Amino acid sequence: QYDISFADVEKAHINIRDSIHLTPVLTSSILNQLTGRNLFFKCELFQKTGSFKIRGALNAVRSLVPDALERKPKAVVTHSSGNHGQALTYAAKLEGIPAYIVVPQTAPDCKKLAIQAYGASIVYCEPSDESRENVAKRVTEETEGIMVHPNQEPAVIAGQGTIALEVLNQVPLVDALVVPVGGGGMLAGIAITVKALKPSVKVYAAEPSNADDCYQSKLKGKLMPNLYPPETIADGVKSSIGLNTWPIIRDLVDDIFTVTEDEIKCATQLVWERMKLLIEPTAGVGVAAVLSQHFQTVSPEVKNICIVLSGGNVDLTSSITWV
Amino acid sequence: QYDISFADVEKAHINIRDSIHLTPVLTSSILNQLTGRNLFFKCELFQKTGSFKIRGALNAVRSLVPDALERKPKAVVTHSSGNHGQALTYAAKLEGIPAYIVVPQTAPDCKKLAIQAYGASIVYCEPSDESRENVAKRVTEETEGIMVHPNQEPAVIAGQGTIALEVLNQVPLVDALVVPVGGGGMLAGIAITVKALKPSVKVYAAEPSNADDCYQSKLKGKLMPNLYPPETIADGVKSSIGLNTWPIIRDLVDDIFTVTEDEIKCATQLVWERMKLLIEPTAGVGVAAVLSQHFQTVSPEVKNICIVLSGGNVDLTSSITW
Numbered sequence A: 001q002y003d004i005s006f007a008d009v010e011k012a013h014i015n016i017r018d019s020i021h022l023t024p025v026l027t028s029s030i031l032n033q034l035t036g037r038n039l040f041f042k043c044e045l046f047q048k049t050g051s052f053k054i055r056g057a058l059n060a061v062r063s064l065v066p067d068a069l070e071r072k073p074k075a076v077v078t079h080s081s082g083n084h085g086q087a088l089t090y091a092a093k094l095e096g097i098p099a100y101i102v103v104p105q106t107a108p109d110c111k112k113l114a115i116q117a118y119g120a121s122i123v124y125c126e127p128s129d130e131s132r133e134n135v136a137k138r139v140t141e142e143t144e145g146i147m148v149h150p151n152q153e154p155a156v157i158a159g160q161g162t163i164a165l166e167v168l169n170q171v172p173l174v175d176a177l178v179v180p181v182g183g184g185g186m187l188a189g190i191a192i193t194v195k196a197l198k199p200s201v202k203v204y205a206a207e208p209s210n211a212d213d214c215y216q217s218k219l220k221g222k223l224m225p226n227l228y229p230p231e232t233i234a235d236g237v238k239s240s241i242g243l244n245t246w247p248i249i250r251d252l253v254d255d256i257f258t259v260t261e262d263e264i265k266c267a268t269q270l271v272w273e274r275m276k277l278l279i280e281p282t283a284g285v286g287v288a289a290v291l292s293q294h295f296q297t298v299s300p301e302v303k304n305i306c307i308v309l310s311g312g313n314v315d316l317t318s319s320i321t322w323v
Numbered sequence B: 001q002y003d004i005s006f007a008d009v010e011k012a013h014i015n016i017r018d019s020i021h022l023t024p025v026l027t028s029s030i031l032n033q034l035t036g037r038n039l040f041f042k043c044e045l046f047q048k049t050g051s052f053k054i055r056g057a058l059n060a061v062r063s064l065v066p067d068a069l070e071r072k073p074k075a076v077v078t079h080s081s082g083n084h085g086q087a088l089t090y091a092a093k094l095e096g097i098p099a100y101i102v103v104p105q106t107a108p109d110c111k112k113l114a115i116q117a118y119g120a121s122i123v124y125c126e127p128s129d130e131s132r133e134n135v136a137k138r139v140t141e142e143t144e145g146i147m148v149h150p151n152q153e154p155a156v157i158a159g160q161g162t163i164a165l166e167v168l169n170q171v172p173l174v175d176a177l178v179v180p181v182g183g184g185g186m187l188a189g190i191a192i193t194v195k196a197l198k199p200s201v202k203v204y205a206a207e208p209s210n211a212d213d214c215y216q217s218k219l220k221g222k223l224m225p226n227l228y229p230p231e232t233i234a235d236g237v238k239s240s241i242g243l244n245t246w247p248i249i250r251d252l253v254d255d256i257f258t259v260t261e262d263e264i265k266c267a268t269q270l271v272w273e274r275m276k277l278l279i280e281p282t283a284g285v286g287v288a289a290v291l292s293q294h295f296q297t298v299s300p301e302v303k304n305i306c307i308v309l310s311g312g313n314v315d316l317t318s319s320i321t322w
């Protein structure tokens, strides 16, 4: 049916469990006091590499093949330099294979240094897609490597779904999961998992209003990517949903809540100040959603809500500016 | 025998457990790797009010009596707008009584707004220690209220001990606790509890080398308070140890580790960036201790080490300085 099944998610859990953390679910009286709800916070900001993306990246390194004629990847390649590049590099290090990140000439110095700092090799391209594509294909082919897309690769979607296996096991009375959405790898893997195991539990997406392709796609009933690169402080969710995650999100996600930049900022600061968790602002999206006016339409029967705090990779010096 | 015993800590536990958080114990591969030990972080930064001080404060509010006919305090009165006053204010809220904070008339608007934010009621005094004391005495008497010393009050020391009761359950094979020390209510409470329940477990104190009265006192065998008010980023451990906590510390604490300002700052930043926990610098004291050269020489048999991350009340904006 879909590009992954619950079986694939369990295969992914089996494949990655020896190398990830079973991150805690934390609670807060203060957030429970404010929102009306009984909240549970799945702390992927404490995951290895600082975000959940190690789940899909390690599943892809451990299950994908480079070629018909070679079962073992000899390198990994991606155009994504943030949380996905960091996680894919850590996964490749664990398996003893090199990682290459394809980076435009125009990337900021800090971005080049930091990819270097996380242990990958940089391969330069022109800021064009013809170039970026030529370059990554050439690298993938010459290194006998796997190209691992941050959100549309089935093995990555399946890995990110393992978050929901842990949540359901850790919070047996959970009523809904709230998941920030960018490309929808995490949303789709979670939705497959929850709807296969306990479809009475709601799956809600949380998205910046400034980057609201998932909401507009669910509204229209077809995939409507952002027409222009979005501007948002939620840097980790600027990708649009894509062809492999959209059908899952269309059919298996219950609702989508959009939040403004101010709402993301206020929720992020609230978590820092009152929960003492260094989430990145992208992980404040789901918190904003549950605090938002529209979330008041969620039935009072939906009491036990687990919000995924998806990452903690924040640049500290320069992130006090908006607070 | 001391101003408390373990019996007092068990009473405190029963008195407070329904209203405080049983805070989690978290771990970190990178910090294991930097220290060569199995570290366990007792996350009192997640406690109600953002520090462990609600344990001692609530125990005091539910134990101490006013100088009045009725047994129950009808208010709480404090000098503190920090972790102590915040804790006492919340304890007062739980008991449905006002909390008053005595404030010199010349406080900045910023401080006053901040105080009112956590719900204390300001009573003004003149800016001298004379007037502060006299106004606090008057208010406490007129309101049939109580005051609570931040580290020498026996009910406070007993409530702080409950930290260790939890740690010993959450980390059964723990070999040592590392505890930041200022006035030493936390350290003494913990030391009573550990030495009663599992005395082979080490109790180690950590303090800034800029405020090293605990280290000097243990070296000399006598209480040697700081000669002048210390300068340290570790704001919450500027107090010296006092007459009630000193004999417990003298007898039941195994060793004291001092750490420089730079070690405190680097430890605090390491916990922010690698553990994503927003500790205050005072809570980075204990981390800095376990990272320090002196600690590296501690016997390898002392493997499982529980560090108390004692608070998370840090001004986010001010962090720019360091």
Ligand SMILES: *Cc1c(COP(=O)(O)O)cnc(C)c1O
Pocket: A051, A052, A053, A083, A084, A150, A151, A180, A181, A182, A183, A184, A185, A186, A187, A236, A237, A239, A280, A282, A283, A310, A311, A312
């Ligand atoms: C990637 C990322 C997301 C979004 O995941 P998608 O699968 O792209 O929807 C959310 N939060 C953080 C911290 C991320 O790094």
Ligand SMILES: *Cc1c(COP(=O)(O)O)cnc(C)c1O
Pocket: B051, B053, B083, B084, B150, B151, B180, B181, B182, B183, B184, B185, B186, B187, B236, B237, B239, B280, B282, B283, B310, B311, B312
């Ligand atoms: C009060 C405090 C301490 C020290 O406690 P004492 O009992 O005064 O030694 C340590 N850390 C934090 C965060 C504090 O608030």
Ligand SMILES: CS(=O)(=O)Cc1nc2ccccc2[nH]1
Pocket: A021, A022, A023, A024, A025, A046, A047, B024, B025, B026, B027, B028, B029
């Ligand atoms: C992922 S972590 O935070 O680095 C380690 C951890 N995982 C936990 C799960 C439950 C309780 C405490 C836990 N400490």
Ligand SMILES: CS(=O)(=O)Cc1nc2ccccc2[nH]1
Pocket: A024, A025, A026, A027, A028, A029, B021, B022, B023, B024, B025, B046, B047
């Ligand atoms: C405010 S708190 O103390 O972090 C709530 C809490 N306490 C826990 C203990 C164990 C696991 C998760 C936990 N969440």
Ligand SMILES: [Ca+2]
Pocket: A065, A066, A067, A140, A145
């Ligand atoms: Ca290939």
Ligand SMILES: [Ca+2]
Pocket: A181, A182, A207, A208, A211, A212, A213, A214, A237, A238, A239, A240, A241
């Ligand atoms: Ca979007």
Ligand SMILES: [Ca+2]
Pocket: B181, B182, B207, B208, B211, B212, B213, B214, B237, B239, B240, B241
């Ligand atoms: Ca000291």
Ligand SMILES: [Cl-]
Pocket: B077, B078, B079, B080, B147, B148, B149, B150
């Ligand atoms: Cl006081």
Ligand SMILES: [Mg+2]
Pocket: A003, A243, A244
């Ligand atoms: Mg497809």
Ligand code: NA
Pocket: A026, A027, A028, A275, B046
């Ligand atoms: Na918490």
